[PDB]
């Protein structure tokens, strides 16, 4: 889908990407990751869960496929019953804009620590 996912990136670098994560059933969840852990428990913002019916599976066996989509919103999915994750869609704001946003967050956090040091005195 001409996204060109990064060639040397991991889960700390794939954050806030619109993932298309596959499970053991095939119940594909599409949404933005915002956190993970050692067991790969993924929170998913604006997530949608898509499946294929049993009648559509005969047409899928060797065209249009009518998938069943349900809307989950902000969910938190476990890492046991998942199989694979890919990157489907890029986020809204770019890498330089995320860098400027992270510098603003660091400056705001340093200002908050200076405010806590001023309130402690």
């Amino acid at each position: 889908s001409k996204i060109q996912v990064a060639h040397s990136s991991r889960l700390a670098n794939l954050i806030d990407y619109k993932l298309r994560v596959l499970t053991q059933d095939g119940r594909v969840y599409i949404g933005q990751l915002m956190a993970f852990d050692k067991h790969m428990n993924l929170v998913l913002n604006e997530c949608i869960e898509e499946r294929v019916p049993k009648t559509q599976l005969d047409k899928l066996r060797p065209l249009n496929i009518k998938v069943e989509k349900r809307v989950l919103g902000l969910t938190i999915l476990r890492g046991e019953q998942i199989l694979s994750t890919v990157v489907e869609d890029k986020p809204l704001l770019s890498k330089k804009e995320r860098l400027v946003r992270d510098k603003k967050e660091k400056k705001q956090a340093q200002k908050q620590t200076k405010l806590r040091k001023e309130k402690e005195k």
């Binding site: 956190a35 969910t75 938190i76 476990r78 046991e80 992270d102 660091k106 806590r116």
Partner: protein
Amino acid sequence: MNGIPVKLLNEAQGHIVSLELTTGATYRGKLVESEDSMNVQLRDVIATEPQGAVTHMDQIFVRGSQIKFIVVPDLLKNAPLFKKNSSRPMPPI
């Protein structure tokens, strides 16, 4: 140690969430008290079996390994667990 997702599951205590089990039964109700092992307890539970029918339990308690996922409300979209550069105000000795 614990991690961000179990802290997020412990964050939304006392809110209407929706579980799905590994069998296919979807629960929905108010979370009583979540744990680090995700063995979560719900109240005013409405249940949908994988056969299709809908029933109502009063006080359910599901084990964490038999959970497909759980849906938190959308106002936890903006949480301080999601902040990457939040500094730490002087941890004690």
